Amino acid sequence: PEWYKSAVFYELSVRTFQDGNGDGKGDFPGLTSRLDYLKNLGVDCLWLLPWFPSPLRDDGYDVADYRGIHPDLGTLDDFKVFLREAHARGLWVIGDLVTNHTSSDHPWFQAARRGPTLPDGSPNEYHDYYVWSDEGKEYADTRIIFTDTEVSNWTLDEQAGKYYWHRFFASQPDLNYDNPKVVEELHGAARFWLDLGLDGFRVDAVPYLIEREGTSCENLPETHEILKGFRAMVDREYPGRLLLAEACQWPEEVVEYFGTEAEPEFHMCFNFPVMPRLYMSLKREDTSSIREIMGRLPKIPSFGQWCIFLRNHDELTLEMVTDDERAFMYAAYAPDARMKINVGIRRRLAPLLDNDRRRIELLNTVLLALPGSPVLYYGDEIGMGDDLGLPDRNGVRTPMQWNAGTSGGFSTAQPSDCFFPPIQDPVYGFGRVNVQSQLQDPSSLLKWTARQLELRRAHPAFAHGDLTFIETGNPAILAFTRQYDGETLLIVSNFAGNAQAGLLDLAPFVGRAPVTLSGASPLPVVTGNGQYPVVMGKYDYYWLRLNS
Amino acid sequence: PEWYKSAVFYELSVRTFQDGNGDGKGDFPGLTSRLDYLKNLGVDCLWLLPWFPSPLRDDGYDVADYRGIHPDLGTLDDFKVFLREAHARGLWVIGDLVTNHTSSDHPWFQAARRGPTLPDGSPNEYHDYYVWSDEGKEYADTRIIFTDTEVSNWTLDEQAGKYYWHRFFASQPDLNYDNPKVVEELHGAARFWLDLGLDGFRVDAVPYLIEREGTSCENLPETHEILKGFRAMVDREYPGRLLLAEACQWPEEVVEYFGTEAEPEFHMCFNFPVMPRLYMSLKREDTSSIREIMGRLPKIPSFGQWCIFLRNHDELTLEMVTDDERAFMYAAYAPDARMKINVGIRRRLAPLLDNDRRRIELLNTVLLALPGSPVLYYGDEIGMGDDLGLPDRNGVRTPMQWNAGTSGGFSTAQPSDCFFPPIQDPVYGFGRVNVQSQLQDPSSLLKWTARQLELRRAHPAFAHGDLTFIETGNPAILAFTRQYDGETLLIVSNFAGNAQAGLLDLAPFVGRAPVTLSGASPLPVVTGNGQYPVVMGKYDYYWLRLNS
């Protein structure tokens, strides 16, 4: 099976991981010097956030050169050293392809804004690279994604005297994918990095590629068309490489980004639909929305694999939940208005869960036990907090906390000279929360995460097995089976904060012997009608094997 | 009924708790300013470690003046203000009465080592306050308690040309309790403090008052008589004041330090027999130990109440335990040789349990649920560690860690200037383990301990009920009821580090529904023959209520 199906992912920003020269910004030489840490954590694949030259108006997602390294982060040779040294340890590394839009400082758009026709006689080839409007009335009935900061997806450009389109900030003008010249430009930027030996791409914001008047301008077939062209190129020209899609839509729409077996698209998509339902189910102590939303995801093609996660560099997004659910999630997890941003919640995993390690453990359990490949977000393995006095989603991207020395070992610059300030409070600051202390503590959250990934890595049914929900008689208790290659695991999880009893329907497995995955503690044989009484402590997780 | 039966005790030492004036030594003004903290934690009664003038060769337990305040800790003035502010918060205060022995620098031993008769001709009435011999040959068949330091319980005095008796250090000569003037002198010392409003005394080294030839010199009939007369004096004269006794012995001998209804002795005694079995059942994952030794405890008088603890200012003592049990304890809990001392182990609780919060919560659960009155060792509520670079048993008496500031908030003197250095290592140092942090953390151990304590006081069967073990089918699971005034608690505890199944024998309670104590979540009703199946996750505790 493909490497990505068996891999564990780790999402970092090199501007925020490890500063190597005291300017207060993370860089590639600083990341390289930490590769052993990630290896020994149990990670296989590093997903780096954008590293290209950029004014950093959307923290680097507004690219002004698709084929360079941002001068903050080092040189193209620093990048090459880092790639051969990650590969030498057997890590894979994937990039972030920002295909929907460039920065307005990108030279294509400095060219395009001159207008269809140059001051010179001739037509401007670059004008058609972007999406222009005389009045800016097209594509109405089209939501605004960045809702706390933009009032329209059209913006007036003094130079061109026309309107240009942008799904995100005005600093990020959309690329026009109806121009074949733009599709080649994208292909050629991907080739440049694959040629360097990068292992693949997380492709950002795929639903918003093609616009069409009279539609929502999400998930249009033309978009899927272009995406299949990209997969067809990679298949032909770089077999083995991974394309991974960010596509925050509803179950029915997300699954289309795998394409089909006849016409493949992405190898992987994030499982955005479950992520918010995990959090809500913990507050209602009812797990049915996990079962409902999981049950709407169809099966995916053979090459496919879900990517599963709890948090990331962005807001905990609520754009694709019911209106009732979003109101509930705000009251439950954003009690201060400062905690919201756009249509989401800008908080890290530990503070979302009141820093309760029993809860952090339970959720990481469910992350690791669901059909997919897990991606961890840097710092959640040590329980990092957030800095809510920082603009946009930056309070969730503070520097990695390595020890209790200057700026948590991230830099020898002082906290207020760092790009973002490292967190310094009594609960989450680097005095209390850092890698070094957790390397020496036998019962660390970090030690726990490592040992828990070891446990998954010894049981391939987690990566490759099917999934079937067991009836339980108690909505607080979620049980399911993962089956593959003969092995049958049974995962049992309590979303309630006190003891719960359940009655599992194990009728398909009468005569079988449940043992724990850790130390094979035996449990009673499934007998009779297979209805199986269980009791569970607050936030307990049972990882079982049903022996035939 | 009697206030000590229903109280939570907290053991601290003034010198290491809080320094008010910045000389690096804890003082009574500093302790006074922290009474809010202990009141809020849920503590009812402070239990102070010897505060008297001393050369501190055994850390205050070698007393040189029974009626004063050691100048390190302030004046008798400051101690008065302390008792007032404690009492104004509804806090009882008991002291330590060190009764078997005094310091070489006590005026009595100075006067006594001047021979049986003086230079002038008169008799020396002080020579007989202490126990002398000419050859040092009486009382073999007697052990050395400080096996690591002392080779004989006799020690020649250069100046008196005789040997004096001492159970502990040669710096702490044993007082002679065949001399009735000594008894009066102790009643005189106790009344000094009772008269100031102290609420009682723990009496240390109580089993060693009387020596007799041919005998063990422990637990002697004449020893209980002096004690019986101390109880009489107190009851007759300061009624309602508490007498607590440290007596590290086998169960059948410890129970008679209560004496009887006819002849009362102590109100309370430390339950030394069970405490080392909690630790052994954890490692063996086998609670048979605890049940064996609890059944060997005979019933106690009506005024009687056990005092349960996990740890104290001393080594974890293994003297009163089997050779095989001691070898098991050392291998499991003393990996390094200098963690051993005096047939014991000198580590604090959190290091003993590998800093595993699940293991720490579990044993605090059992401390709080066994029948008796619990005593907390200071800093265990936040998870302090120990320092083995300090001699003797001082490694567990580090300054209380209040916040991340200078010397952990214990003093403005910097760490090398403190009486004992405050701990600074990466796992248990004050930058990471401290009170202010855990006040702010919604999910801290300090907060878990306070909540668990107020969950206990809400259910008076813990303090007063009886105890009945319950069959379980699985040695790793301990289960028992506490019954009192028509309330039946049910306590189920998993001492294994993975999931365990049990069959709870609940026949008496058929028809009744087990209800969770935290949140009132109901479990299914006990049907059929009372055989009630359960599963439990690693180190789980269930605190249940049975309702008819």
Ligand SMILES: [Ca+2]
């Ligand atoms: Ca677009």
Ligand SMILES: [Ca+2]
């Ligand atoms: Ca004596």
Ligand SMILES: [Mg+2]
């Ligand atoms: Mg730098």
Ligand SMILES: [Mg+2]
């Ligand atoms: Mg002082």
